[PDB]
Symmetry: D2
Subunit: 343 residues, 4 copies
């Protein structure tokens, strides 16, 4: 099976397996796991922040950040098609008791003026806007890169209003490789950032939240409350350190494979836009096919290719370390066969 | 005094209401022993063709206990993108029920049935369960617009197929009914619960009512207790409510006629208004062609003796009600005319 | 019917009925109801606080106070048999996301030393103790008065720890009448005080919360969220002013009637302890009767007396304005006849 | 350093490090991790339940169970000194919006009659009692074994009222080893059971919840919301399988060591009760010493012995795989010296 469903399916490299087996560990609840401690120190340093927190998943990373930045009844401004709003089981309402305030965005970039208008005036009928979330390499729009200038202007707006800014940077390294903007620069215009180690970076488990000392202390207590307070998590952190320090550069290979995939799919005749492919995702439309997205995903599966439908007429293809050029070439042969059948 | 066009919530008690309240037969509602509250609820249920009803201190509580009784923690509630529950209820749905709003754009409060269908979440571990669809009749933000019965009917059909609850925020459902000629029981027939206000156009000093099935109302009553709405001798308030429900509905037509007159005349003056959009007691005025924004115009109006609310930086809302007579409207219009000269 | 079920059943006096009819009103959401404003002004003044907030019920008064004093995950120290812990539908957990930390007490008085031990130390595993609640004229213990010294000592402990103090003073005036301690004296040892107007004071609806301006502003927003933001509530406030300003002194009559009732019931042969009757409540045990509390309550109803069973062997009798000495004497004749039948 | 703070400090065995390194993995979100799937299958099998769910910690294990057994506003009956109430950061109130209803217990055993009386009657003022929690091998009381008879009785009561029963079995195997009661028998009197792999069983991370298929489905969704939905978690499950299948028998060694430790401490003169030591814990009182628990803990630390204070006058000592009889002897020599200084 050629897995193009997501970059979450990446498996540990041999270097990672050895590192986990030889991991120096301790009880993290007491802050005594050396490897977890080093991963957090490294993560904080890399993002230009004073502190960091390791978590079991990007969802918990986002949720502890929301809890640490807000109070019950607050409102959180976020992009209309963001992961926090659509794919996190409504956790923000249950855990933090906060309201989402959706703002339309163009490929992840909310117009600064719209953000300004989304901030609630001081009134008894309205919740207090205390957080603005930005997702970089906006998933739903096809792994699009949010311009640094966009984040910079929103940060200015936030500062004037005393509002916190959190970047959902699950794939922030993909954004950095594509844009040439160091992650510490994106983070310089945010109060906190969550990034995943378990997707394109290939770690088996976990993400990290970076930010100020006080913020992280609150997020650490939130993590304890949610059930993320683990013991000898250094076994996971060992692979995390390798993901952070050795798996970033090669992300360019995933981007190269995504573009190649898009160009060939277009050449075949599929409804794809190579010009929109800047990171590791390709959106394919079923508009010119005698079947919808769901029916096409089924056809692909029966032929050996796995992918997810994101709407009734759109499917998402995602490249990563475990889908080589060879697999991309094989996938294309299948796509070519299916095009003749469904065009 | 001032010409108050800010909202219909400012209506004061009629002479008949004051006497009824002061002479109300009461009891302890916690024991379900207040005779006036009981009669108000019986009358409300009957009027909407439902089995039961619950008196609450505000429309906000009416909506929130309904949301609580219809949902479980983590569920999603589909509602109109500019609805009151979403924008003006202090984020209560999140704090009180732990639910997520699922905004669906609507044309004048009417969410496209197919859009509602698409908004229902598929069963997936990543997604919360869609357990409630809320509809606001005479959608406030759009200008007191009337949601067509057929729209509500279509959404009900969709909800039923999916086992989803339907709640109508009918704060001004009687205005909708007067304008459309559709009995409120018909709108309610396509919903599981309906909340309606007695304290706005109907002129009661305090209160709203939620109507629905017996079991739902029992659950809503427990939610009311938890929220702090379980009052004692509330019969004092229910006395005015009975009069509002039974004698103040027909005259809403007068408020509509006044709002239409106001809109037509504002249009003649040259203001950015759409008389064709005015079917109930509200008029939206845009300040696009004025040399001042909404807030600046509101201040100028206040300075001239007219009260109104800005609903955006370019829009103002004018609301008619029992306490603004046709003569008051004429006076406001004469002022609106002079201000047009000053700001045009 | 002679209603001894509770003081909540009190009906409006003729004075109140007239006041409600001619009450000057306005939209309270805009802070424009003159009568509500005067009631809050008078209440704040009466308890020596900066501000006050009118609410639909004592339950909401307690809940908006908890919300205004706490943050999600905090702990609230309260008496093990208090109304907030027992009869408020678990609202503190749902509305504020806080956890109760029950402390046993002797007739409503928690041992100051136990309160100190209940304060959580700073640790990632523990919620932060941010509030201590005290109930005066403790309901479940039979309308007992909490000593001023107890409240004074707990206030000292709270201050030393930066913890807020809330007095559930639903029947604080009854406490004051019995102890001779002015309500301002009680209030001085608390950050906030909730007191009911709808019980012994005879108003038909409402309670009031008093405290500092910032606290009341937060409580007012909580009231809006909960659904307590009414419009022309001046009609209710008119009766409320009369309840607060003219119905306090006569509470002494309820206390006298309760004691008289108790002394005579004991004389008849009922299991009552007149010595325990400190305010307007009398606890009657049914152990020596041929039927239990529920069966006896039914026999009483048949004879024209209403009361509530609080357990299988206990009945609570409560006196109030609508229970005159003549009603007490008539009730006693009924109790006399029933003792002949059920002893 | 001789670590007697907790059994959570246990480090991975050689067999475990190798297993993690070669673990076959997959994306758990897709239910595709074969090692996680095998661990859950084995757990369900071992406890005689239909399904199982791996979680990052015992705290999440308890919290997803509570969320899956209850609705907002419900009440949960639990032992007055249970972990869920004291050491889980008020999570039940924030996550589930439920109220704890503490019930006194003798070393973790709540009197069945007290439990019956704690169940709320159907009344608008009361929350609905939807769950009863029992902690077998009650931590606070000193790792005490709750009698099977007690659990059976409470199960009978729960059935009568249609109430769910959850056993916090963080140390259910220690209880089984000491009582001779198979874990499957304990589980038979409960709807759900949470047990840890990260304590005495020596896994670096994780716990498991077992129960009916529908309950586990709800718990799994709760896990996703809380942020416990990991990817290639098989790395951790590999050590978990070894913990569950190979590390149970040797727990007897920890019990022998704890008993020996207690016996010798008593001979030295310390306030311990060797007769109360049946599993891997020893409670040491400081009432007969010159310093309190906190001061004695600091003295022990300076001498090479780590332990935690559980109150101002009580210290908890816990044995585990990483504490050999030799380590206990060395510790005893240290305690001996300190008795001379602080007795
Ligand atoms: C921007 C962003 N933020 C947060 C998260 C949540 O992280 P996890 O909880 O999956 O580790 C994801 C993962 N997303 C998953 C994927 O893409 O396969 C799916 C969509 O849930 C994400 O893409
Ligand atoms: C559709 C609808 N639903 C619910 C409510 C809430 O009712 P209350 O809580 O104010 O009684 C309102 C009141 N609305 C008020 C007004 O129009 O003046 C303001 C906007 O909050 C409403 O218009
Ligand atoms: C009965 C019981 N239930 C649940 C938990 C929570 O498990 P984790 O979240 O620590 O994995 C613990 C851990 N307990 C810890 C320890 O003993 O060192 C401390 C006390 O929090 C426990 O003892
Ligand atoms: Ca991975
Ligand atoms: Ca090749
Ligand atoms: Ca009104
Ligand atoms: Ca005129
Ligand atoms: Ca009363
Ligand atoms: Ca361990
Ligand atoms: Cl190690
Ligand atoms: Cl009456
Ligand atoms: Cl729920
Ligand atoms: Cl008036
Ligand atoms: Cl908060
Ligand atoms: Cl593998």
């Amino acid at each position: 099976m050629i897995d193009l469903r997501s970059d979450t399916v990446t498996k540990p490299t041999e270097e990672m397996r050895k590192a986990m087996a030889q991991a120096e560990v301790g009880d993290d609840v007491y802050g005594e796991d050396p490897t977890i401690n080093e991963l957090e120190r490294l993560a904080a340093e890399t993002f230009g922040k004073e502190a960091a927190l390791f978590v079991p998943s990007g969802t918990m990373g986002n949720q502890v950040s929301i809890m640490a930045h807000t109070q019950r009844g607050d409102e959180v401004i976020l992009e209309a098609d963001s992961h926090i709003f659509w794919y996190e089981v409504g956790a923000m309402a249950v855990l933090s008791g906060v309201m989402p305030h959706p703002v339309p965005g163009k490929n992840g970039a909310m117009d600064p003026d719209d953000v300004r208008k989304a901030i609630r005036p001081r009134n008894i009928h309205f919740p207090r806007t205390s957080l603005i979330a930005i997702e970089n390499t906006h998933n739903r729009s096809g792994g699009r890169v949010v311009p640094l200038e966009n984040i910079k202007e929103i940060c200015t707006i936030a500062k004037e209003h005393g509002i916190n800014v959190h970047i959902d940077g699950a794939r922030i390294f993909n954004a950095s490789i594509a844009s040439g903007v160091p992650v510490k620069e994106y983070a310089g215009y945010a109060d906190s950032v969550m990034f995943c180690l378990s997707k394109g970076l290939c770690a088996p488990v976990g993400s990290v939240v970076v930010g100020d000392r006080d913020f992280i202390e609150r997020a650490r207590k939130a993590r304890k409350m949610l059930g993320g307070g683990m013991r000898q998590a250094g076994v996971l952190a060992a692979a995390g350190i390798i993901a952070l320090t050795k798996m970033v550069d090669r992300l360019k290979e995933d981007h190269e494979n995504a573009r190649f995939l898009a160009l060939k799919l277009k050449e075949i005749g599929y409804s794809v836009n190579p010009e929109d492919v800047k990171t590791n995702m390709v959106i394919l439309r079923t508009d010119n096919l005698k079947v919808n997205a769901h029916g096409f995903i089924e056809a692909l599966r029966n032929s050996g290719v796995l992918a997810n439908a994101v709407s009734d007429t759109e499917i998402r293809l995602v490249t990563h370390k475990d889908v080589s050029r060879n697999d991309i070439e094989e996938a294309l042969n299948i796509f070519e066969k299916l095009f003749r059948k469904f065009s």
